[PDB]
Design a protein around this ligand. Sequence first.
Ligand SMILES: Nc1ccn([C@@H]2O[C@H](COP(=O)(O)O[C@@]3(C(=O)O)C[C@@H](O)[C@@H](O)[C@@H]([C@H](O)CO)O3)[C@@H](O)[C@H]2O)c(=O)n1
Length: 211
Amino acid sequence: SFTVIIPARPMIQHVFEKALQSGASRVIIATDNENVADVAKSFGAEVCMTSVNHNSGTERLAEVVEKLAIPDNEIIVNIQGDEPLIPPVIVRQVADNLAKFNVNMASLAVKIHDAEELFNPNAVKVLTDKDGYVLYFSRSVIPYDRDQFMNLQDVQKVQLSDAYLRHIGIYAYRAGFIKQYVQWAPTQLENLEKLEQLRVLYNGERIHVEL
Ligand SMILES: Nc1ccn([C@@H]2O[C@H](COP(=O)(O)O[C@@]3(C(=O)O)C[C@@H](O)[C@@H](O)[C@@H]([C@H](O)CO)O3)[C@@H](O)[C@H]2O)c(=O)n1
């Protein structure tokens, strides 16, 4: 029974329409610009004006849940306004993962098939435990393949033995958590890597990442 919020600081329309297929019972475009608000409104969207003063989608969602009075317990699925494609079915998966795996933040990943993105700092790497509980997210390749990378010359000699995972920009969290998230001070960790999800891990909170 989730609600979708798309942080949007036409690309957005695709996220928007992919969102509609998700089964979301509400899809809001979160923006900080009149031009985006109007454009968003032009494709039949509920819009929420937010301030410029947010360094992350999660942070912007916090204001959105306040302004709209989204009840604490409502499940919010942040679908970053830059998402390539989302089999909408997955969105329902992550949302239900909150209670399935007993966590305040659920997310998703995809099996990496090209090794060149292992080493791309804009391709965020994620790695979990046996149940999908995240160990760490990084712009650096994780895990490290000592035997293949130690004095590695060709990215194409690299054998990705189903070890690698690329993080997708979709979060599932109840409004109340987004409020808590932003009640935490920004971390050095999230700020070095520029990855909002690292505030949850740093605050001793766990994250679930589904394949
Ligand atoms: N101050 C900001 C910055 C971003 N956004 C919203 O956040 C999304 C940005 O996604 P991103 O910038 O592409 O996101 C990152 C990224 O670094 O690409 C950031 C990071 O927090 C983390 O969530 C990773 C994921 O790991 C997905 O790779 O995704 C955009 O839709 C934007 O409108 C925002 O509202 N306000």
